């Protein structure tokens, strides 16, 4: 029933402006810093100078620490509906952070990656390819990535089944890639993104390992995906309260990953998606 929310639903423009105002006030007065990402040795590991992970929630890598690898990746944990670390929101890896991306995926036991960008968008590099191609395994440091299968779920979503081998162990990792997110604006409808989230959840199954979600910066589109999944988990567990607030969910996300849900158009798209889920 609380899905009441629809009965309650320029309003959205004002609401997004309030999210921006509140999150900016929190950056200024709250426990919020970017010390690690600004260290000289880490600056080159950031795709964008204005996107640094907050120290408070940053992903601290330990895999291969004994072999001298740094703890740093541009990525943050985001809490899920049970208060556990349910998402890792990170950037699209650079040539020199590919190895770190796989350390992240391996260390935290990630089963599903959601990628919400293309390698190149409108003539600009946005993400390095970290997956293998047909009959062309990819060696990245000590990781060997093999392509087992590729499947288009619909015209906008690719599913890759990967075999990832490290230190004599092989794991299955599924990667879902959204293939048509526009350079300006948002998708024509929420349907195919919802299909992506639905499939990710089937592949994830039970168990606490985080979903790995990324776009190019790891902010806007990434925050849309994490929020849609968070709200869908509330819905499926019958835990939408009568005072459910999408505003509060997005604001909370913004305190964990910088600029989670970056634009008014993204916020409106998220509203459209949630309304559709609520029927």
Residue numbers in the entry: 6 to 8, 10 to 15, 24 to 293
Q: Which text from the study accompanies this structure?
A:
Protein tyrosine phosphatases (PTPs) play a critical role in regulating cellular functions by selectively dephosphorylating their substrates. The ∼280 residue PTP catalytic domain consists of an α/β structure, and biochemical and structural studies have led to a detailed understanding of the catalytic mechanism (Barford et al., 1994; Zhang, 2002). Key features of the domain include the PTP signature motif, the mobile Trp-Pro-Asp “WPD” loop that in the closed conformation positions the conserved and catalytically important aspartate residue, and the phosphotyrosine recognition loop. Here we report the crystal structures of 22 PTP domains, including two tandem-domain RPTP structures and a detailed structural comparison of this protein family.
In the first category are TCPTP, SHP1, SHP2, BDP1, LYP, PEST, PTPBAS, DEP1, MEG2, and GLEPP1, which have a “PTP1B-like” accessible pocket that harbors a basic residue corresponding to Arg24 of PTP1B. This pocket has the potential to accommodate pY at the +1 position as in PTP1B or potentially other acidic or phosphorylated residues in positions N-terminal to the substrate pY. The new structural data and analysis presented here suggest that a secondary substrate-binding pocket, similar to that found in PTP1B, is present also in SHP2, BDP1, LYP, SHP1, TCPTP, MEG2, PTPBAS, DEP1, and GLEPP1. PTPs with particularly high enzymatic activity against generic substrates were RPTPσ and PTP subgroups R5, R3, NT1, NT2, NT3, NT4, and NT5. In contrast, RPTPσ, the R7 group, and NT4 group PTPs were quite selective and showed a preference for a sequence derived from the phosphorylation site in N-cadherin (pY785), a reported substrate of RPTPσ (Siu et al., 2007).
